[PDB]
């Protein structure tokens, strides 16, 4: 039996017909309304590790090719729709991390009609979303630091998108988000939407054959200046509070930020190391997270104590600019 | 919340809430992509009695009015979906019902499966199924039958039908043709194509304020000569076999048919009491159950035996030719 009509059915799918289901739909096979059936069902029954990798397999595949030396390659990424709308900090923690001497290759998107995404935030700091593949991949080698455009490299998507955005709801594309970067990356600080997520997407990870943190902050797709909730791949499930890290909390409040317009001019005022608010003690946080997953240092602790001195330095804008250069005629 | 979006979220919907998605889908207000998601999301959690009842009104009202006034008024119909291309017994067994003395609003349509639908068989047989509602509704209140063909008084699902068989699998509105009666049939042998959709078919038709039976026999979407399973408005469930009703039992495969001019010569020997096989049985069983849903016999074995009469008399068909030249005239 066709495998679309048998998710539809709402059947537990088997690797193989899970990664067939993805792949027609990359493939630009199914109609809207069995795209819509197919992913309904699936959001239903509660997608499975196994599943989850094999789509995810799917989508990697589909994607345009890029393939880059520096390793570790780490990535902050979240599931998105965690239905709060904070700042996006993971873009200003892989700069931060990148800035550190991790290469990165962030994974990102436009905010769908709210200019809230880290390609928003990107292009308005001077990031010419149109640079090539080929050319985001030199950047990565070279500077140690990519953005990986989803719209460049997931052509499907332009036609998943509107299905997802009618259906109003969760899918297995915020999970897959985060699963497929397009440059390999292997290391990751991946935030989920909610902590029954957490499990399940670090044995994705793993069967992906990455490693790093799965995290969730209180409701938010990200670490947050709170109780955060953690799993670690090769290793277990715990909690992370700012404390424990030399940080100290703040309502979510104060990781809210403001309109796409004033996101823009806190990121400036963030990476010269001139804001030292809630803000800036996030965005260490994360990028600790990040040094700590890709090894650049032996503890989540000593991630943050780097992170600090690095953000305090201001080179990590230094960074940004530096790319913003790169990618120009 | 918006309706849609709750019944894509897989929640159960509160009465009006499941009318509202309906008149929505009705009106032509849901997009194809939104439809396909809460249709195959409310097939998979299992669709409430409280909410096909809704739907079903909601459905009534969006269909061409038309009013009868005799009362009570029967119709003998069926979920459809069971693949099996039986005879259409239901159609003959409505018309010995209505010669009888019992009014008749059986409701149909033709059969895309293939082809042989009760549409397709009254329409061979001269039934000018282009005839206007109002038409039919003075042959109902004037011979006592009369034929609502789908297409001529639900022209609102056209807004469905297309995703209906793209999707490819079974939704609520295979449940609610036989709930959407457009002349308000009150009397019933509602056929359903499983067994488990006996007890909540018949608890929607109590809701609705109907009296009958929801009927299931062996794999048929309708009675036969074997071992059928009921379940009676206000009275409960019950197995009904041939021989408590005086009939002799026979494989489904006596009860097969053919094409529409086929059909059409049968339905002509049995309505004109010539032929007294298995399809004679069945028919009289069906039309049987009729006669004992409206409250004409006061038990089903009186209702066969009055049935086998009609049969045997020709009566029917007279009535058959009397209700195609009142189209014509």
Redesign the interface.
Same mark, same amino acid.
């Given at each position: 039996m066709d495998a679309v009509?048998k998710a539809?059915?709402?059947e537990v799918l088997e690797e193989e017909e899970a990664y067939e289901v993805m792949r027609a739909l990359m493939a630009g096979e199914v109609?809207?309304?069995?795209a819509? /059936?197919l992913?309904?069902?699936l959001s239903?029954?509660g997608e499975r590790p196994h599943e989850i990798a094999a789509m995810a397999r799917a989508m990697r595949e589909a994607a345009r090719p890029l393939r880059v030396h520096r390793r570790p390659l780490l990535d902050i990424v979240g599931t998105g729709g965690d239905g709060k709308g904070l700042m996006n900090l993971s873009t200003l923690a892989a700069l931060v991390a990148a800035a550190g001497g991790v290469a990165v290759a962030k994974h990102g998107n436009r905010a769908a009609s709210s200019r809230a995404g880290s390609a928003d935030l990107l292009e308005a700091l001077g990031v010419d979303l149109e640079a090539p593949p080929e050319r985001v991949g030199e950047a990565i080698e070279e500077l140690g630091f990519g953005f990986l455009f989803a719209r460049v490299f997931h052509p499907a998507m332009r036609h998943v998108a509107?299905?997802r955005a009618?259906? /109003?709801?969760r899918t297995v594309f915020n999970l897959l988000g985060p699963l497929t970067n397009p440059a390999g990356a292997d290391a990751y600080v991946l935030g989920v939407f909610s902590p029954e997520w957490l499990a399940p997407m670090a044995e994705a990870l793993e069967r992906l054959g990455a490693r790093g943190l799965v995290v969730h902050g209180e409701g938010a797709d990200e670490l947050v200046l709170g109780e955060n909730r953690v799993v670690e791949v090769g290793k277990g499930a715990y909690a992370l509070t700012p404390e424990e890290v030399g940080l100290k909390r703040a309502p979510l409040e104060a990781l809210k930020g403001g309109g796409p317009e004033e996101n823009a001019a806190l990121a400036r005022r963030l990476l010269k190391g001139e804001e030292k608010g809630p803000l800036a003690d996030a965005v260490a946080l994360a990028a600790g997270a990040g040094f700590y997953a890709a090894g650049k240092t032996p503890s989540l602790k000593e991630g943050v104590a780097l992170a600090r001195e690095v953000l305090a330095s201001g080179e990590a804008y230094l960074l940004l600019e530096r790319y913003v250069a790169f990618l120009r005629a």
């Open positions: 009509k539809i059915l709402g109609s809207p309304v069995r819509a /059936g992913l309904v069902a239903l029954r509107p299905v009618e259906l /109003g709801v």
